[model samples]
Target: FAQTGYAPVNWGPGETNDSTTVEPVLDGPYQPTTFNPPVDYWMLLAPTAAGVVVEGTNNTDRWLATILVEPNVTSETRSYTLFGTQEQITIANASQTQWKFIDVVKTTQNGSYSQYGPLQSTPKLYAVMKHNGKIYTYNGETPNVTTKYYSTTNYDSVNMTAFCDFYIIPREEESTCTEYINNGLPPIQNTRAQANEDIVVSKTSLWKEMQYNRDITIRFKFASSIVKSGGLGYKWSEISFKPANYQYTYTRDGEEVTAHTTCSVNGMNDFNFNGGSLPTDFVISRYEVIKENSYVYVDYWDDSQAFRNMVYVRSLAANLNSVICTGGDYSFALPVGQWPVMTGGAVSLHSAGVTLSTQFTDFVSLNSLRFRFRLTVEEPSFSITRTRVSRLYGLPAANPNNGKEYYEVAGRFSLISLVP
Candidate 1:
């Protein structure tokens, strides 16, 4: 498999709002297509795909899946939702096809179908995606340097299809974080309204702002091999993105309000925040709190906002190139400008190098982070190259390198001890 500039894979909009460019892959807490001010965070790895299998995480548990991205010269690619729910798939083509998606999703414990409870919702959601590397080329072309045409003239593009998505048990949950204003709490010294609108007082504004204003700094020590000379080394081969933003609203007591959110340093820093004149609830009233069932179905804004994600990477060494995509001479294909990596990363990334502004929403306190390190077991593409809309990119045509696609979720940690 090939590795390029590590960019954060974000779930957001495309160049056009009307465009279904970014579809709803995982439709759960992870899918907030309408929410403004999306949930965001960054991903970091020490340079390894070891023990790291496909996985997603949250504070409670970890979900692991296997890797699979088909590399070919002439087949189209489509992403499918592969889970245990799919038993036997009688594919249309009995021809030579490189299939990808879950090979199987066996529950950790044995149980009848229905007894499995929420299969995808449990850490038990284990799966494997297969890459049908061989694609039908009757209507397409695969690289064949054996013939002069491939080396000189018939230089067509190969489309490597990589589609995979699985719900994270621990990370998948209804928003339990709830916030309410202590209309009764003491107000700050100054309160003023903006523009000609009624001069309203922002009782919880100051403290919330102060809290969100807190700064954090972190660094990941790239595996020595990745940064070494001639070993996947760099001489300006880094890939990255430009920061962009869109937001969604979560309710705090009716009065639909636009939540505040920001993605700093793009892929490196993903954050969504919401500030209100009302006091914030640090715990998720719906899920985490059970002292008493308020039975109150408080309403909130129905939309979700996703902050823009961006990133940049470059290689500064010489002759030190590894496959850009997994199959070929794919060098770090950086986007045209300086940018940020955006993402409402999985809940598990709430800490580590990522920071969340509690002033904006509910009990999403900055706690510890669990890195889903890729523990590698793996690659090959013939002449196809496709670009990642948000995270990675396809290689240029001039390079005849067949590429491969591989992925991993590294593991890391942070501890937020709330003795109170």
Candidate 2:
């Protein structure tokens, strides 16, 4: 204990001098964690917002209105555009050409390791012009125009930045293809037998007779707004009616019998019916108004001065060849006609301060918005008569008699756009 400076060599034990052989074996090879870099993904920047806007002013143009109007005439279509202002509007046809105003709206980066990013820019823009309350967009598909408006708050402002996205493994690569086929056939069946037999009679006799004598007077009455305003006038007063004859032949007992129903017009407004009479089994059915191709012109005062200067600028023609009476009432509203021809130019609206030479700017300030032009039949009345007849030989069972009365009247009436 006192002499602790030195420890004797091999003090514990010196058992054997032979060397021990040792072999090191590894259970499995060491593997470090794999380092997988993030992939880059990208997508094209599409339009987020699009709409119509005013020129120079980024304000939304709500005045642009589009409506589908099918005219009564065939192969004829009319395009009408109305605006609140007198600015000449011209809508250019859409094309691949870049719009005059294109700017970057936003930029986004995908992943931290992404090398490139997509640029988010404003959508392609288009320009349209409005002139004389008409919006025109010209394309190869002219007249058939589909207007698209691209609006932005600051289209003039340009901002550019780097855009990127993280790459992702496409799910499409792992998707499995599947085919679906229907092999089942539809059910088939034989023809079904009728439950009841049709009626059959010997020496069958059938007679049908109709007499339509009606006075139809179409009046083009001026509405109080047009009459009191004294700015708009119509030139469609004289209307005429034409009657058609009904004739048919039927086979009776293997022999053909001809029947003729003659119709004549007594007056310009009256259609007098005089036909060979038959049994009272007569059924009064369809009634229609057939009109020849004609044009009706609407006159408007060019100057604000009352009835001082009138211009026959607006003209709307009758497009349909005929119009049917519905529920004993006839409506000429459908099959709208286009104003193809203009006497001077676009018609001017009447305003207190605005002169005729000056473009009518305000749309709401006018007395009336819609000027309705209608052709109607008034007080259409029909009378029918029937008489018993004794059996006649050789001749048909019923003799043809003619006599009926009817009355009708037709009439007419008297018309914008703004955007904010």
Candidate 3:
């Protein structure tokens, strides 16, 4: 199958040839489009005798994910062993072809394998790589971010798996080599594309602008549960939110120049998108919050007249360039800066009222648990900044007395993390 994405050139450092073609292949005993150097990207290659072996840039690209197609296999049928040569681990095989996903960040050469069956005899094998977002708009203008998607159900014959690498622009960050695999066998039915960007152009004004940073996410749910018979067990679920950008071409003097920036899914289980349901299986890769003109502070609960052993005091604030807190533990830190900073030091509670704090407690639990934190700001009584108003619209520098005022946090919100 064809490998799709921003770039389709098959010119890794060790590759013997550069591909102008869509479909990449291997024939005659172990003929692979070799990858050797400073130019490691993805290519479509196969092993005539062995399963495909993948590597990193300069043979350095890492493994993201893999899926095996198992239409028919038995004593009479064929099979293979999937693995990272260096890791010496078999990811999967044909008979029990399940999605084999890994999130590593290094050389993938030893990340090779052996597909026992011959290519001519076995079902066709293919992989597609996709990194969404593009630079297309008016000539000689800051291109607008696009809310677009692309997909193909063309190759629905053999069982296959697909994955991609994404870079979030606005946040100045990159995501791990994430994985996404369809449960279906053929035509891996609609492994769709997703994004959230708004290209808002007003005809009344000669100016056009693109706005994003909305609560947008891409989800991949099974049409039906993986284990048909319920209670069989549950698989781990994952979701991520990162900054993304797209080049917009517009008219200044009417000359077109392409500029590029950035652009930037998930799960099953007792997942919750709102209310009080806890996200037992979730991890927020990138998080950021900014208020126009207000400042913020971190506050913790302390109804001391009510309890003692119930609290031991802990805090950490590396961002403010602050130091340790409470008990002299290296894990704790005192609060420093204020609105851009949502103060920490709150007790992170688990389902049954247990404290999850320690010098080495793993932050952000991703399986079966509950916790709460107060993104607190000091009372406005001692300060002119409106408390509730500050939480919403943010404190205005020099307080805009434009006769406009905001009440407080009730039920309305733009982004909801749990289902209503």
Candidate 4:
């Protein structure tokens, strides 16, 4: 009859942080809340008009209690500490109103109560719960998108946030390379004193003044093998060329002294070297040994003072557009307005009928050079500076396309090495 007139359900007397809290749900008759329920008998209100049913009372004899047992029927009031606790409940109610067990949590003292139910409204990456009713539920964090790299420097102006070392170089025989020294991903540069004082020395810029191909490769390495002695195993990451004007100082045996030295050169084939006074460690080379670290700074000043050397010939046979490297491994095609590195050997280069037959011997040692070559029908005559930068450094960027075989570094070494 009416499912034995006994409702089965479970309920939890919600928790509280409050030291003094009252809950009557599971505490039975009026009593201070403890870890245990005050009364063993509990009955829940039924949804229909069947009245409340008390458990373990007159067993099996109409579990529903009427006004007859209403005298013993009384709600409980409990003073709970650490409140939330639950227990299974079986009861009946006469009203027969729709009902369900509710779990609540009290966060603050004498504060509000929050309910946890079946419907999970809050979204989460993952949700885990137990069927035995959860005493507490919570909400969490917000989402965001973050960036790592960005520039804050104001346009057409400056800012402290973006500052680093850089250099200004030479291009087209001018200091216009500074314009191309842009703030981009590449071209890490050199600086002298500060960020604003960045610079590239003149000797380094000598190639910038050349008028031919930019394919010239200048290798950097240690000057001599004699540096590893006397705790002076010197090293260098980079070097620049500039005419230095400073006192030369040398120290020995706890004694120090200084002297003045000077050297200069002009655009002519003349070197005016006058070391007014000398030091014990001075050399005829272009660089001054940094004895402190004992590193070397090459003689870029000599290149700065030297004039443009090498010839720029053009107009060759349309099919003679190739470079020939013979007689030596270090030889390359003739760069217009620039000189090719030639050791003591014979090199044959021809475009159309124009031919450059070089007879080099002790070349870099001999301080003179004469460009005597024959065109298809004629041999022009002219001379230029050979190695003004204190070496075989040539000038380029001025190629007068003689339409014959304008052989240059434009093509592959394979094609030239295999041919004449």
What's the lDDT for all of these models? 0.19, 0.20, 0.20, 0.19
Q: Is candidate 2 or candidate 3 better by lDDT?
A: 3
lDDT tens per residue, model 2, 103-148 = 1111212111111111111122122222233322211122222332
Q: Which number leads on lDDT?
A: 3
lDDT of 1 by residue, 101-200 (tens): 2221232333211111111110112221111221111011112101011111111122111122222111122121000010111233496755676653
> Model 3 off-target regions past 4 Å?
1-31, 36-42, 46-50, 58-86, 93-122, 129-420
Which runs of model 4 end up more than 4 angstroms from their true locations?
1-273, 281-354, 358-408, 411-420
Best by TM-score: 3
Lowest lDDT 10-residue stretch of candidate 2: 176-185
- Rate residue 390 of model 4 by lDDT: 30
For candidate 3, report its TM-score: 0.16
Which of candidates 2 and 4 reaches a greater TM-score? Answer: 2
Instruction: Write the number of the candidate with greater TM-score, choosing between 2 and 3.
Output: 3
Worst 10 residues of 4 by lDDT: 411-420
Runs of candidate 1 with Cα error greater than 4 angstroms are 1-238, 266-347, 352-420
How does each model score on TM-score? 0.14, 0.14, 0.16, 0.11
Best-first order by TM-score: 3, 1, 2, 4
